[PDB]
Amino acid sequence: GSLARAGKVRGQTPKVAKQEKKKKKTGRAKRRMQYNRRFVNVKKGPNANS
């Protein structure tokens, strides 16, 4: 074919910057948060919308 449309949508997409946010916990304290979230304090999913 014709090799002239390469990069089309990647160059067409508008550029949006990442919002700065509070940093994430790491290690033994990140996996404590998941345990507290799912077991001690609680038919849908973690990322269910509306």
Binding site: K43, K44, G45, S50
Partner: peptide, 30 residues
């Protein structure tokens, strides 16, 4: 008062979203 997984599965069991409606109905049942 959200969506009904039963109706979703019954209406979309043969469309592109069948694999997702089955998953949602299984989540509702179990």
């Amino acid at each position: 008062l959200g969506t009904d997984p039963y109706e979703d599965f019954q209406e979309n069991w043969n469309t592109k979203h069948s694999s997702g409606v089955t998953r949602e109905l299984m989540r509702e049942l179990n």
